[PDB]
Amino acid sequence: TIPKPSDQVPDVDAFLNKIGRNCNELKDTFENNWNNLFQWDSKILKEKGVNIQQRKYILKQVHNYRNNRPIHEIKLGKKSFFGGERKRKAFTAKWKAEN
Amino acid sequence: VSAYIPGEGHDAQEHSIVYVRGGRCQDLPGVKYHVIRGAGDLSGVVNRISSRSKYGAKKPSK
Amino acid sequence: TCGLVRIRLARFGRKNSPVYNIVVANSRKARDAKPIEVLGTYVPVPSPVTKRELKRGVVPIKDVKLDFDRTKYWIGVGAQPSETVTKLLRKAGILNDAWATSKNSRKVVFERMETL
Amino acid sequence: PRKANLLKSLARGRVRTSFNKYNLFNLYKKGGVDLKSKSLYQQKWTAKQETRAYHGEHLTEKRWQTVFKPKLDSVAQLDIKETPFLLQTFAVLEKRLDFALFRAMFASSVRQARQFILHGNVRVNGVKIKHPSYTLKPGDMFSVKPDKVLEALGAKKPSFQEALKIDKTQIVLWNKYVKEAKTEDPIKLSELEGDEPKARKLINLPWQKNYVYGRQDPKKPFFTPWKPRPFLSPFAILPHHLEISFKTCHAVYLRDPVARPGQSEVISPFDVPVHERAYMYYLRNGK
Amino acid sequence: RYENRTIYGDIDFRYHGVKLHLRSAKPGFGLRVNHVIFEICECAGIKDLSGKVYKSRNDMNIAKGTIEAFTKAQKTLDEVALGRGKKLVDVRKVYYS
Amino acid sequence: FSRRRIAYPFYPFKKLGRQHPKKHDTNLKTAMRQFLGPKNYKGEYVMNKYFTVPTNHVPNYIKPDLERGQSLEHPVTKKPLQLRYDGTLGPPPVENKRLQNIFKDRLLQPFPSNPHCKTNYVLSPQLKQSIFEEITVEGLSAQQVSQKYGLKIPRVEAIVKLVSVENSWNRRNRVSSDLKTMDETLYRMFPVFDSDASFKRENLSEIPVPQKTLASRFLTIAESEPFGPVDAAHVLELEPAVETLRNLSTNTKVIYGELVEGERSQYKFTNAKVGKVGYRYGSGNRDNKKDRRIGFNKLGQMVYI
Amino acid sequence: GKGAAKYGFKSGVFPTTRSILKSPTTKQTDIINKVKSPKPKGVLGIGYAKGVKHPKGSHRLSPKVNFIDVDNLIAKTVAEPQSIKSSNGSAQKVRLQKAELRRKFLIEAFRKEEARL
RNA sequence: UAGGUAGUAGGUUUAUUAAGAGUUAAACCUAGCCAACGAUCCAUAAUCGAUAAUGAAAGUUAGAACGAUCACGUUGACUCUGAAAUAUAGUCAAUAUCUAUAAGAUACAGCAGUGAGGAAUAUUGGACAAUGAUCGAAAGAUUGAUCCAGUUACUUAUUAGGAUGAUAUAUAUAUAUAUAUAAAUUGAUUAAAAAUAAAAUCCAUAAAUAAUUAAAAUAAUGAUAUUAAUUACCAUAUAUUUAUAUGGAUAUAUAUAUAUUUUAAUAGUCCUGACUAAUAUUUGUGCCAGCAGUCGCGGUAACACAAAGAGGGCG
Ligand SMILES: [Mg+2]
Ligand SMILES: [Mg+2]
Ligand SMILES: [Mg+2]
Ligand SMILES: [Mg+2]
Ligand SMILES: [Mg+2]
Ligand SMILES: [Mg+2]
Ligand SMILES: [Mg+2]
Ligand SMILES: [Mg+2]
Ligand SMILES: [Mg+2]
Ligand SMILES: [Mg+2]
Ligand SMILES: [Mg+2]
Ligand SMILES: [Mg+2]
Ligand SMILES: [Mg+2]
Ligand SMILES: [Mg+2]
Ligand SMILES: [Mg+2]
Ligand SMILES: [Mg+2]
Ligand SMILES: [Mg+2]
Ligand SMILES: [Mg+2]
Ligand SMILES: [Mg+2]
Ligand SMILES: [Mg+2]
Ligand SMILES: [Mg+2]
Ligand SMILES: [Mg+2]
Ligand SMILES: [Mg+2]
Ligand SMILES: [Mg+2]
Ligand SMILES: [Mg+2]
Ligand SMILES: [Mg+2]
Ligand SMILES: [Mg+2]
Ligand SMILES: [Mg+2]
Ligand SMILES: [Mg+2]
């Protein structure tokens, strides 16, 4: 079932921008067709030639949109500036020595 | 170890890499081993037609 | 999920062909290690229907042999079920709508019943 | 499975499960299996040779050994002759789908039956099977595609040229007969190369109206008006453990073959001593 | 021989060197004995037999010992019954298998 | 002492003597040719006894011991022939008394070397039909039918099953002409089951033999003390043989899950006692052993259990 | 595989089935009677003989068997709410329902166990 | 390894502990305790099963894999927090590498992987889709647990083609068709075979090529994945999987008459004197070359060495 485009994100491109995680640079693989994006599934996306992680994310965000849950770029997890829990002790010491 | 060397003519020097297995040369006393013949510097026995795997001999391939 | 005692699925069987072993276990002990009490089994691959059967309109079944009374007891003493296990229990009719999360939350075709 | 190679040679009088002409001859000229002037081991070996050639030549030795059951089966009548217990050594193979199909006479051989079921023609309780190692339970139907059954029990469908050549000779014989009758319809094969309808149009004998000798329905995989196989009689042994209906080509596997006071239901071309020797061998794996 | 197929009891007999041990057998269980014993049984009509030779396994002495055991070590049930003055039923036969 | 013995016929045949260098013929091949007789332009070995199919309800099984390897009969008259000093065939000088005087049992004995293997009889279609009617319309029990006719109850059930299938095929018009002809030929080949002939009737008191009976026991009862079948059964710790024969002749909470419009499958929950339900821990992996268990699916797919 | 024939040819093991009531109940009268009967002496005796002493620090007898009053146990583990009608909000209602369900199940289980034994 | 033992054996008390106890610490007594049915001492070894192997069984063997228990996370000691730690933590020392040179950091027995050792044991893979685990109110974040694929005949299993098949021409409502010319491989000249083996012939099926649609998972999410499976030009519409009728797909003759993708087959390796299954024979070598589990074989007639032929196992 197709949903309506909202005021905040009325376009496919706008939706892509909203969701993020480098979902931009994906306006060529499918053109700005609202119905097209929503009806399309995983296999179709794979055939077109998108990534696995990107494919997973888009579908999830589509689903959220359908259910009217707030879509936004929940960024992927990042290691600490110093290091991963294991490497910190040494890295931190090195950083201190440098500075 | 005193190892037997089977087959016709062999190729073994005073330093050759050789693999030993646990057979026994029955007529020679005090030698309780065989050099396995396909592997190492010990080469496969030449112009062997019968029982080729028992020596090194590869399949002639027409 | 939370807890020390937890009702969850331990994996069994071979590659590309899982069967599950509904257990109650410690949270710390491993996924396929020996648990406190095995309550039941669960094969996720549904029983395959015939072409004629499909045409008629008969749904596949997922077999879930399960000690009901034991499971209930374990729930009572406060052993939290996993996301899949709790769903299974709800489907059976042990647990209420209370356990259903927001993601789960659609007209019903066939209603539940006990049979022999 | 073990590859088919020299199964029906004459210098080894091995009696295989088949309706082959060479197999028939082997069966004919074997007599018994001679166990005289042999050691115990030698006797056991000769038993193994003969008995396994018939019972599961396609099976590998190790595989066979694994399947081989020591505990034989029997039935007490509780109402005389001595039951042949040890004929049951190869009772376990009749439980197989392939063997059951062969017994039913839905195949010429065990190999052929195996091929049929691989190709997905046999069914057992509706469900189609592509697995010879499938084992029937008592009460299970099994059903071969009727065309394949007909092919198995029918004659070999001739090539067109061969059929035409046969027709030519028949025509000549007919002409000779009519000449003889007078005293007290030709075909040129070189011209008529491969026009089947033309050949049909040409031909008109009393015993075949148009169709060439071997091709009344070329699209069917067997001989013309269906007739039986060239030496079908001496191998048509109707089994006890199967109930058969040749119209539909269905067959109920009703029992696991079992030995009575009179007889065994394991159909074999070997006397009981041979089967005893085989059993002795396979208990110990020839120790 | 019991039922025209096996020996009556489990016999244990010494002939010179060879120590024989021949157990009776349920019907269908074949001849499972030393090759000489087997040969003798085939000729003497014994279908079912288990047993094992200890000490000497001298073929000739086995052959001599085993026939001696058969003739001598065996007692038929009827003879035993007569000696003791009792009924000596075979339970399997009574049952009808 | 065993050699490799080339399997020549036990019976006597015209061996090779000398022959033209190029032909390369073997004695076995010659023997086979002789057995076959001469082959037609068509391909048929007409003179061989065993070529044509019997239309007699009398199976033409093999008697190589009786006819002494001489298989060749004249097709029209079924009279025996031999291979003379010339290549032409002709009648035998001495007649065979073995082929003339043959028993009932040996006519139904497909292989000469195995007396025990015999052919089972074929049921006449009318009889099968009558059985089917009895079971369905008249509503008689299968045991009574078996007693009447002389078949076994599983056999009767199998027959019934086959009859209904045949009827369905006839309704659909699947039973082709070629199939019918084949069925007729098969019927003609095999001997018919007679319901009156006592020797032909199947023995209906055959129970299967258990383990406890086979292991022989003996009891020293007093000389006069009686000891019947019941007593023997009691000693062995079984039910009596008659009772077992009679037996041969003759709950758990299950829930189903709710089915919402979208979801594709139900959830059947059967009850099960704890300590008896699961997949056990530290069981024997049998997959790399040759005693591995291979089952089959509902769709006939081969599946590792 | 050889030793599985002891356990009915059962390869692999289950964990021990865990007793719902972990002591004998008060309703199990026969057990109580057995416990309280005069303990034997002599050859097949249990405790200390009347005349004979026991080690200074140690107790003379064995400790007494705590018989479960099942109703009391139920009350303690699974108390019904005193504030009966205080209930607003969806999450709170859900929690209350869950609690009720847990009460039901554990009550049933214990009572069943008591009856079952 | 024949004597061992001096907190040793036992009693009385105090501390420490949640709590017993020469478990530690302290104090005071008694003279014990263990041992040739093996003490003390040394050496070796992670232990075990409803696991695996083998046996008729009692047993014996393994302890890879599945699971349960222990101990360790380069070596040794101690401390802190804690219900529980001599923690893969911290402290100090020991050994060996890193820079950043500092009352530094690291230690792959986590996963890949490298060098070494060795007869010998894999990818510097993909995904969090499933099942678990940690954090979070949730949104969802992490996850070399895990699930998947990769390499490796290490193991097991299923397939890895069936039926017919001994010649080639030429002549002339029946039917044993019959003559004639030609040819015919390695052996061998008859019980010496190789050989129904080939080649042909009939019939499929895999793979391919197209179309379709699961299931592992549902609220949605599928790494595996050119997924398994099914159909053979697709769909609907009747009956009981088969059969027929429609709708459209298609192409030549002159909208409707016959058709409907394609299509195979390929095994080693050991052995043939007896134990030990292998009789069709022949050549070479000449106590040499070589064979051999065991007895033995080779000195011109070698069934044993090296080969051809034929044969027997397992595959
Ligand atoms: Mg964030
Ligand atoms: Mg070779
Ligand atoms: Mg939580
Ligand atoms: Mg103290
Ligand atoms: Mg101490
Ligand atoms: Mg002190
Ligand atoms: Mg000691
Ligand atoms: Mg150690
Ligand atoms: Mg050990
Ligand atoms: Mg292990
Ligand atoms: Mg390991
Ligand atoms: Mg540690
Ligand atoms: Mg290290
Ligand atoms: Mg340490
Ligand atoms: Mg690693
Ligand atoms: Mg190296
Ligand atoms: Mg996850
Ligand atoms: Mg990774
Ligand atoms: Mg390896
Ligand atoms: Mg294999
Ligand atoms: Mg030649
Ligand atoms: Mg394919
Ligand atoms: Mg030899
Ligand atoms: Mg031999
Ligand atoms: Mg050699
Ligand atoms: Mg000697
Ligand atoms: Mg020579
Ligand atoms: Mg040689
Ligand atoms: Mg050769």
mmCIF file of C-alpha atoms in Angstrom, chain F residues 75-175:
data_model
loop_
_atom_site.group_PDB
_atom_site.id
_atom_site.type_symbol
_atom_site.label_atom_id
_atom_site.label_comp_id
_atom_site.label_asym_id
_atom_site.label_seq_id
_atom_site.Cartn_x
_atom_site.Cartn_y
_atom_site.Cartn_z
ATOM 1 C CA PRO F 75 6.821 -73.024 -32.923
ATOM 2 C CA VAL F 76 3.516 -74.220 -34.469
ATOM 3 C CA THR F 77 3.430 -77.746 -32.963
ATOM 4 C CA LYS F 78 5.607 -77.231 -29.803
ATOM 5 C CA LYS F 79 7.461 -80.487 -30.648
ATOM 6 C CA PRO F 80 11.147 -80.800 -29.613
ATOM 7 C CA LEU F 81 14.145 -80.594 -31.976
ATOM 8 C CA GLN F 82 17.943 -81.052 -31.970
ATOM 9 C CA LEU F 83 21.067 -79.918 -33.818
ATOM 10 C CA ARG F 84 22.190 -82.798 -36.085
ATOM 11 C CA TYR F 85 25.599 -83.389 -37.761
ATOM 12 C CA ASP F 86 24.423 -81.026 -40.531
ATOM 13 C CA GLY F 87 23.548 -77.403 -39.676
ATOM 14 C CA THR F 88 19.825 -78.093 -40.230
ATOM 15 C CA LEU F 89 17.574 -78.887 -37.247
ATOM 16 C CA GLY F 90 15.449 -82.032 -36.915
ATOM 17 C CA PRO F 91 13.486 -84.164 -34.419
ATOM 18 C CA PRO F 92 15.239 -86.187 -31.667
ATOM 19 C CA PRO F 93 15.679 -89.979 -32.048
ATOM 20 C CA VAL F 94 14.861 -90.795 -28.389
ATOM 21 C CA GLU F 95 11.933 -89.130 -26.572
ATOM 22 C CA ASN F 96 12.454 -87.488 -23.156
ATOM 23 C CA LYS F 97 10.463 -89.054 -20.289
ATOM 24 C CA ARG F 98 11.555 -86.248 -17.905
ATOM 25 C CA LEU F 99 9.664 -83.486 -19.767
ATOM 26 C CA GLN F 100 6.555 -85.680 -20.183
ATOM 27 C CA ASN F 101 6.282 -86.631 -16.486
ATOM 28 C CA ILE F 102 6.622 -83.414 -14.427
ATOM 29 C CA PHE F 103 5.151 -82.477 -11.037
ATOM 30 C CA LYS F 104 2.684 -79.767 -9.971
ATOM 31 C CA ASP F 105 5.174 -77.925 -7.728
ATOM 32 C CA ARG F 106 8.011 -77.821 -10.292
ATOM 33 C CA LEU F 107 5.763 -76.182 -12.939
ATOM 34 C CA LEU F 108 5.535 -73.225 -10.506
ATOM 35 C CA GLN F 109 9.303 -73.188 -9.846
ATOM 36 C CA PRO F 110 10.967 -70.373 -11.868
ATOM 37 C CA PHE F 111 14.579 -71.351 -11.136
ATOM 38 C CA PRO F 112 15.714 -75.014 -11.344
ATOM 39 C CA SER F 113 18.332 -74.694 -8.577
ATOM 40 C CA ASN F 114 16.002 -73.221 -5.890
ATOM 41 C CA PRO F 115 12.997 -75.465 -4.958
ATOM 42 C CA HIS F 116 11.767 -72.997 -2.314
ATOM 43 C CA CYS F 117 11.137 -70.044 -4.639
ATOM 44 C CA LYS F 118 7.707 -70.560 -6.214
ATOM 45 C CA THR F 119 5.394 -68.186 -8.066
ATOM 46 C CA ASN F 120 2.410 -66.710 -6.261
ATOM 47 C CA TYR F 121 -0.968 -67.133 -7.985
ATOM 48 C CA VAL F 122 -2.886 -64.355 -9.744
ATOM 49 C CA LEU F 123 -6.396 -63.357 -8.701
ATOM 50 C CA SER F 124 -9.087 -63.431 -11.363
ATOM 51 C CA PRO F 125 -10.587 -59.919 -11.925
ATOM 52 C CA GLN F 126 -14.108 -61.186 -11.132
ATOM 53 C CA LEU F 127 -12.948 -62.525 -7.745
ATOM 54 C CA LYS F 128 -11.238 -59.205 -6.935
ATOM 55 C CA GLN F 129 -14.447 -57.355 -7.847
ATOM 56 C CA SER F 130 -16.513 -59.654 -5.600
ATOM 57 C CA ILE F 131 -14.073 -59.058 -2.713
ATOM 58 C CA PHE F 132 -14.324 -55.290 -3.247
ATOM 59 C CA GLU F 133 -18.138 -55.478 -3.234
ATOM 60 C CA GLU F 134 -18.083 -57.533 -0.018
ATOM 61 C CA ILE F 135 -15.856 -55.027 1.775
ATOM 62 C CA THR F 136 -17.723 -51.887 0.587
ATOM 63 C CA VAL F 137 -21.389 -52.547 -0.263
ATOM 64 C CA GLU F 138 -22.154 -55.643 1.845
ATOM 65 C CA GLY F 139 -19.929 -54.214 4.609
ATOM 66 C CA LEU F 140 -18.327 -57.475 5.763
ATOM 67 C CA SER F 141 -15.180 -57.536 7.905
ATOM 68 C CA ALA F 142 -11.883 -58.349 6.148
ATOM 69 C CA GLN F 143 -11.182 -61.406 8.352
ATOM 70 C CA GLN F 144 -14.442 -63.091 7.290
ATOM 71 C CA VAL F 145 -13.628 -62.381 3.628
ATOM 72 C CA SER F 146 -10.123 -63.826 4.099
ATOM 73 C CA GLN F 147 -11.578 -66.994 5.673
ATOM 74 C CA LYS F 148 -14.078 -67.370 2.818
ATOM 75 C CA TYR F 149 -11.567 -66.945 -0.024
ATOM 76 C CA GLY F 150 -8.186 -68.016 1.405
ATOM 77 C CA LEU F 151 -6.211 -64.754 1.213
ATOM 78 C CA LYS F 152 -4.454 -62.840 3.992
ATOM 79 C CA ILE F 153 -6.066 -59.687 5.433
ATOM 80 C CA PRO F 154 -3.276 -57.302 4.291
ATOM 81 C CA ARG F 155 -3.457 -58.956 0.846
ATOM 82 C CA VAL F 156 -7.241 -58.398 0.790
ATOM 83 C CA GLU F 157 -6.771 -54.728 1.779
ATOM 84 C CA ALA F 158 -4.175 -54.298 -0.984
ATOM 85 C CA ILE F 159 -6.564 -55.834 -3.540
ATOM 86 C CA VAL F 160 -9.364 -53.484 -2.412
ATOM 87 C CA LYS F 161 -7.021 -50.499 -2.749
ATOM 88 C CA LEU F 162 -6.042 -51.567 -6.276
ATOM 89 C CA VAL F 163 -9.677 -52.113 -7.362
ATOM 90 C CA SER F 164 -10.745 -48.563 -6.405
ATOM 91 C CA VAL F 165 -7.724 -47.147 -8.267
ATOM 92 C CA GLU F 166 -8.577 -49.240 -11.355
ATOM 93 C CA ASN F 167 -12.177 -47.968 -11.222
ATOM 94 C CA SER F 168 -10.980 -44.352 -10.966
ATOM 95 C CA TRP F 169 -8.674 -44.890 -13.960
ATOM 96 C CA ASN F 170 -11.563 -46.378 -15.977
ATOM 97 C CA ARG F 171 -13.744 -43.361 -15.110
ATOM 98 C CA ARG F 172 -10.975 -40.978 -16.214
ATOM 99 C CA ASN F 173 -10.330 -43.159 -19.334
ATOM 100 C CA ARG F 174 -6.625 -43.635 -18.532
ATOM 101 C CA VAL F 175 -6.479 -47.433 -19.026
#
